[PDB]
Design a protein around this ligand. Structure first.
Ligand SMILES: CCc1ncccc1Oc1cc(Sc2ccccn2)cnc1NC(=O)NC
Ligand SMILES: OC[C@H]1O[C@H](O)[C@H](O)[C@@H](O)[C@@H]1O
Length: 448
């Protein structure tokens, strides 16, 4: 109950969530309007993915994905189906990216990428061929078009000098060129949210929102072109990359932030940025729990006031431990084993307290996340005429998919916040690969 008072600080009431939801809708509006687009914490970035186009090229496409801890290269075949195109991943390969290839420059990084592409082509009797390439790039970008836009800044702990302010597609063409090895026709760069959204569209035409809850957290949704003041035109809809991860960066979340959030922020690669994401994303969630455990140790409430060397080092409480702790069946075997590995020797009640600390943090992530999505859905609701708006949300990310209860709490809370909306949630199958490819296919019809 001394424990419970500390953890209860993570609670959010219905009214707290409604306040976060209204504030998110307010920032989405400010991000879309010319007069406020520039100071907006929520950037609402036009993506040039549109509802208007007809016709799609068929054939084989290469898809890149950068923005996990792993970089992925795959081949995907697009062909002609019913009411649209099918797509399927045929060939694929994952690569890690080393320290010195990320402490360095952008040039170096994109060379590594180019080196990985060649490797994949070598290995697949492909080196000689030239194909349209789709680039899923999970970072905030200001687009000039479907095949051009600049990196605004790194998120999720990516460093690389000389990337911010530059055309990311340019940076990759410059690296393909500086290798001579192979020719590739970069036809489309998209965000992961957008890739996920697009990949759910084939099976569900109602899918107009894409969401990621993984290392980071973000969404995109189809906006009416008249509301997209940053792109001339009123015809049809364009996908907007909200970048809601940066919500709170102008102080909108100050009343809700905890000591643990301020500590995570100050110690991150990006002080004062991505504050909403720092409440939710798997890059931060284990670290939040860690900090909570340290506070309980210092109050002599956990591990008899003794923390191991491992518990005291940043990043040691991994986000996957939070999910494992919450998967524990009640026998405390999972919890004991995780803590033992961290050099602790926990009692029965220690294990239970650790469980509670995980649920408070993950439950707060789910609820916060729900308020942002509810804001996106209720904003869309305002432009729609039906009695009940039926909308499909495409989702990916290990926090959403793999955390035992996150998805259930998130669904219930979102639904509470969105009256007269019927919401269908679809988890993408190779959303990133296929989505990049499907957008490339359509862009090729005219672009290539
Ligand atoms: C959800 C936004 C949307 N609604 C309605 C139509 C299109 C549409 O956008 C696309 C869908 C697809 S996949 C697709 C397209 C049609 C049928 C089945 N599958 C690929 N690119 C784009 N857009 C582009 O602008 N491509 C560059
Ligand atoms: O990968 C999930 C998200 O992580 C961060 O929020 C990135 O800025 C965003 O672009 C991405 O979509």
């Amino acid at each position: 109950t001394l424990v419970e008072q500390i953890l209860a600080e993570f609670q959010l009431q219905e009214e707290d969530l409604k306040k976060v939801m209204r504030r998110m809708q307010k920032e989405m509006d400010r991000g879309l309007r010319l007069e406020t687009h520039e100071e907006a914490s929520v950037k609402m970035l036009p993506t040039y993915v549109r509802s208007t186009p007809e016709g799609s090229e068929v054939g084989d496409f290469l898809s890149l994905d950068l923005g996990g801890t792993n970089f992925r290269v795959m081949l995907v075949k697009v062909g002609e189906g019913e009411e649209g195109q099918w797509s399927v991943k045929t060939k694929h390969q994952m690569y890690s990216i080393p320290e010195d290839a990320m402490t360095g420059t952008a040039e170096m990084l994109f060379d590594y990428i180019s080196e990985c592409i060649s490797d994949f082509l070598d290995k697949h009797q492909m080196k000689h061929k030239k194909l349209p390439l789709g680039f899923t790039f999970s970072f905030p970008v200001r687009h000039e078009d479907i095949d051009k836009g600049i990196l605004l800044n790194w998120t999720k702990g990516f460093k690389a000098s000389g990337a911010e302010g530059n055309n990311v597609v340019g940076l990759l063409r410059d690296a393909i060129k500086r290798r001579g090895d192979f020719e590739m026709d970069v036809v489309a760069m998209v965000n992961d949210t957008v890739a996920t959204m697009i990949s759910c569209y084939y099976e569900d035409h109602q899918c107009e929102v894409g969401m990621i809850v993984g290392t980071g957290c973000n969404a995109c949704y189809m906006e009416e072109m008249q509301n997209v003041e940053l792109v001339e035109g009123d015809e049809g809809r364009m996908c907007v990359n909200t970048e809601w991860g940066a919500f709170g960066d102008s102080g909108e979340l100050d009343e809700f932030l905890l000591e643990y959030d301020r500590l995570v922020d100050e110690s991150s690669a990006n002080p004062g940025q991505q504050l909403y994401e720092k409440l939710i994303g798997g890059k931060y969630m284990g670290e939040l729990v860690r900090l909570v455990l340290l506070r309980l140790v210092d109050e002599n409430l956990l591990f008899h006031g003794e923390a191991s060397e491992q518990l005291r080092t940043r990043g040691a409480f991994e986000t996957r431990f939070v999910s494992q702790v919450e998967s524990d069946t009640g026998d405390r075997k999972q919890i004991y084993n995780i803590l033992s590995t961290l050099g602790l020797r926990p009692s029965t009640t220690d294990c239970d307290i650790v469980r509670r600390a995980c649920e408070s943090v993950s439950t707060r992530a789910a609820h916060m996340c729900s308020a942002g999505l509810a804001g996106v859905i209720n904003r869309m609701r305002e432009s729609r005429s039906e009695d009940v708006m039926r909308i499909t949300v495409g989702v990916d990310g290990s926090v959403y998919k793999l955390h035992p209860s996150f998805k259930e709490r998130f669904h219930a809370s979102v639904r509470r916040l969105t009256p007269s909306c019927e919401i269908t949630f679809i988890e993408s199958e190779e959303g990133s690969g296929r989505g990049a490819a499907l957008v490339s296919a359509v862009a090729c019809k005219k672009a290539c």
